[PDB]
Structure 1
Amino acid sequence: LTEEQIAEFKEAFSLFDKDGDGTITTKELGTVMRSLGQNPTEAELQDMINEVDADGNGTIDFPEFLTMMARKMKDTDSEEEIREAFRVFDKDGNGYISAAELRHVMTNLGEKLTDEEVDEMIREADIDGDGQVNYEEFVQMMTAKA
């Protein structure tokens, strides 16, 4: 990051850390969300802290806040990259990737496919059963950590 970039994080962080102690508590998180019309229970807010609380000491320090913000940004950038790829792969722009189009993608990426392979790729990724790959289906094929 750069100096302005860290400034943005500090300030975002300060929106939560009113007492300036350099960590954010369940009480403070609760406070921020109360200003959004939601009413989280103390057992609720604890789970939210839990999701960010890497070292597990009950509060969220600044470096922990960083890591999880960088990860929300990475997910944003990934969705953007997935939309750009879909747009390139769906050459006729009809909103669906077809067999022919996937064959072309795969040929462009260095692979040598049979039709039975293309059909089994499409079939495993095909959620609504229409025999082509829409955007939501492509998202799951791109984000499979399996």
Structure 2
Amino acid sequence: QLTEEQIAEFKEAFSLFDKDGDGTITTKELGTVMRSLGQNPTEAELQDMINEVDADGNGTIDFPEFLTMMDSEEEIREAFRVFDKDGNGFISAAELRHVMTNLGEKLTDEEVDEMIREADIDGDGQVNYEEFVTMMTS
């Protein structure tokens, strides 16, 4: 149901959930990331969503199951809104810095700026939705 590219992209997303890198996702890790991006799911809602896809019934989520566990544009647009924390249509360095730190990424301000810069096609020191999608696929 997904192309090879998108599967490859979700694999790196998976890695952000898989903090300790043993290749599976626990309930604790699952909520951690979701909470870090502002979501507030219940321990029951996590466990129930896991159990639905927990095919081999070991209690953790592997990558194949993470895929099955996962209108299209509105998610992409909502993902864009995760970064733009004041909704001004533009993602700023300080706002990229926010998301990065919530996620657990370690970098300097110049590095944040350089990410903004590399994503910026027009040239204004902040990133919009047009290039956000162009960066999301490359």
User: TM-score with structure 1 length normalisation?
Assistant: 0.44
- Point out the more displaced range, 42-51 or 108-117: 42-51
Cα offset for 1:80?
A: 2.5
Contact 1:90 1:101 (8 Å CA) reproduced = yes
Report 1 or 2 for greater relative contact order, CA contacts < 8 Å, sequence distance ≥ 6.
2
Structure 1 residue 124: deviation in Å? 0.6
SS in 2 for 1:95: coil
Q: Secondary structure at the match of 1:124?
A: helix
Structure having the higher Rg: 1
Q: CA, structure 1 residues 109+78, in 2 after alignment: closer, same or farther (shift >3 Å)?
A: farther
Check 1:80–1:113 CA distance in 2 against 1; reply closer, same or farther (3 A cut): same
* Distance in 1 between residues matched to 2:66 and 2:120, nearest whole Å: 37
Indicate how the Cα distance of structure 1 residues 140 and 44 shifts in structure 2: closer, same or farther if over 3 A, else same. Answer: farther
User: Aligned pair in 2 of structure 1 residues 86, 25: CA closer, same or farther (>3 Å)?
Assistant: closer
- Runs (5+) with no aligned partner, structure 1: 70-76
Regions of 4+ moved over 4 Å: 1-69
Give the distance between the partners of 1:118 and 1:54, measured in 2 at CA: 40
Deviates more, 1:102-111 or 1:41-50: 41-50
**Structure 1 residues 120 and 47: alpha-carbon distance in aligned structure 2, compared to 1, 3 A threshold:** same
- Aligned residues with identical type, % of pairs: 98
Contact 2:17 2:33 in 1 (8 A): yes
Deviations 1:105-144 (A, max 9, x none): 111111011011111101110011001000111111222x
The Cα of 1:79 is off from its aligned counterpart by: 2.6
> Which segment is superposed worse, 22-31 or 93-102?
22-31
Over 3 Å counting, the alpha-carbon distance change for 1:62 and 1:87 in structure 2 is: closer
Aligned partners of 2:37 and 2:103 also within 8 Å:
no
Q: Is the 8 A contact 1:17 1:23 kept in 2?
A: yes
Maintained 8 Å contact 1:87/1:93: yes
1:82–1:142 contact (8 Å) kept in structure 2 = no
The number of residues matched between the two structures is: 137
SS in structure 2 opposite 1:24? Answer: coil
TM-score w.r.t. length of structure 2 = 0.47
Quote the RMSD (CA, aligned, Å). 16.8
Pick which of 93-102 and 21-30 moved more: 21-30
* Structure-2 residue corresponding to 1:141: 135
Tell me, which stretches of 5 or more residues in structure 2 are unaligned? none
